[PDB]
């Protein structure tokens, strides 16, 4: 088992994401909130992905399962069949 993997999302990574988003200056408290928001989003997507996988009776999560989970949230993703 493992834990405290949310810190793998480094401050420079968050800064790069914000710069791609078009942010000039960033406050110091943005990082913890971004961590929380990303954790919530990943939980929501992975819940549906795992449900789709376990419905098909297999132990491997597939790109099609992830695509279906994203599609059911109105955020269809191309490039994975």
């Amino acid at each position: 088992v493992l834990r405290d993997n949310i810190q793998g999302i480094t401050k420079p990574a968050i800064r790069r994401l914000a710069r791609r988003g078009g942010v000039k200056r960033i406050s110091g408290l943005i990082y913890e909130e971004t961590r929380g928001v990303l954790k919530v989003f990943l939980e929501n997507v992975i819940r549906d992905a795992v449900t789709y996988t376990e419905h098909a009776k297999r132990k491997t999560v597939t790109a099609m399962d992830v695509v279906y989970a994203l599609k059911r949230q109105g955020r269809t993703l191309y490039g994975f069949g």
């Binding site: 791609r20 191309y78 490039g79 994975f80």
Partner: protein
Amino acid sequence: ARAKAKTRSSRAGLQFPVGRVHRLLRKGNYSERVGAGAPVYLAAVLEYLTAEILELAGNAARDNKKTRIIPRHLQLAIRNDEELNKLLGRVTIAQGGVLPNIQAVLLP
């Protein structure tokens, strides 16, 4: 030796497979029965949409001094055109990036 095999797309001068579209329709649990002209119309619409997207992507690529279409070019073409942007406002494209723009307030 009944007749020369001519596809319905060739009859209509199309490119997309009318027979494949018909098979997908009748295998998709969409309705009990399928009309004759429905696959032809659907193939025509799909061909027009693909042609428009490819034209925009090719123009974007030639504006980038490139010869191969890439997901970045596709994303630029989709985001630039208002019609396609509204059609695919909820669609994420892998390796697409973002449309380059900076708010005037941030500029010095």
